[PDB]
């Protein structure tokens, strides 16, 4: 086995399923969770692995690149097809449930809205520390061929919801945007309550597109906080549907889709806590 085959084999076969009782009442130790996390290969793509002339100008970080097999390719309207974003599988490996991407840069804002248009995205989840360019308007802006207007904006302690319309030619679409702050990169939130409220907000969001599309989830680099959010959502789904969760397997599936998803042992430990809270909050 080549290093890469070893990596892919691990990511396809690792697992640590836990009954919800084990998760809530007898979880693995912090040391056990750290050792388990550190075993998971990054599956990072090297700049050499990527043969897309001109891509570097559209990456926030030279070391964080989209895996080619799952990268989102931009169509021709809006010369290249590149955006630093990957399709991410959801519950039970369901295809294209999410797109994980970096926060747009001024020169990739039109690319970002083209992705939203092309993929029929109706929901954007943005993870940040309010302490990256605003790619949405205060009232109305034009970005390439797209006009974006704010229809509604509501504030709660946990997040801000903006209701946006995107217009391309005579066609207008709705996009819900949720901005969740107080999550510093390479770290976790101080408590898990707000995060679960965010998951509920996402779960409660109606479909508004002509065909179901991916939920776009982003943060500065689009791997750490982005990976934690998606893993939390899939974990909640497992707990609700099956009364068990395989958090190791979730992280491994995420890393097959985009390298480096969930950055730190502390974030992996926080995922366990958040899912134990979700389990405790389940009806009945």
């Amino acid at each position: 086995n080549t290093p890469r085959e070893v990596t892919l084999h691990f990511l396809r076969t690792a697992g640590h399923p836990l009954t919800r009782w084990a998760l809530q009442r007898q979880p693995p130790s912090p040391k056990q969770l750290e050792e388990e996390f550190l075993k998971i290969p990054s599956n990072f793509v090297s700049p050499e692995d990527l043969d897309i002339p001109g891509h570097a100008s559209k990456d926030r970080y030279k070391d964080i690149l989209p895996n080619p097999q799952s990268r989102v390719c931009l169509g021709r309207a809006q010369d290249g097809d590149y955006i630093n974003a990957n399709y991410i599988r959801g519950y039970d490996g369901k295809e294209k449930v999410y797109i994980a991407t970096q926060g747009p840069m001024p020169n990739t804002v039109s690319d970002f809205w083209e992705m939203v248009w092309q993929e029929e995205v109706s929901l954007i989840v943005m993870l940040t520390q309010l302490r990256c360019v605003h790619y949405w308007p205060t009232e109305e802006e034009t970005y390439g061929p797209f006009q974006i207007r704010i229809q509604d904006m509501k504030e709660c302690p946990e997040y801000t919801v903006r209701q946006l319309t995107i217009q391309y030619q005579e066609e207008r679409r709705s996009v819900k945007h949720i901005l969740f702050s107080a999550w510093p990169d390479h770290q976790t939130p101080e408590s898990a309550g707000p995060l679960l409220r965010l998951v509920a907000e996402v779960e409660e969001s109606p479909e508004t597109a002509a065909h179901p599309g991916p939920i776009v989830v982003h943060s500065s680099a689009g791997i750490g906080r982005t990976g934690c959010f998606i893993a939390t959502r899939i974990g909640c789904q497992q707990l609700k549907a099956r009364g068990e969760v395989d958090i190791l397997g979730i992280v491994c599936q995420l890393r097959l889709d985009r390298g480096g998803m969930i950055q730190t042992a502390e974030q992996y430990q926080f995922l366990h806590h958040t899912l134990a809270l979700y389990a405790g909050q389940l009806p009945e």
Partner: peptide
């Protein structure tokens, strides 16, 4: 830029 570097993130890790």
């Amino acid at each position: 830029d570097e993130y890790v």
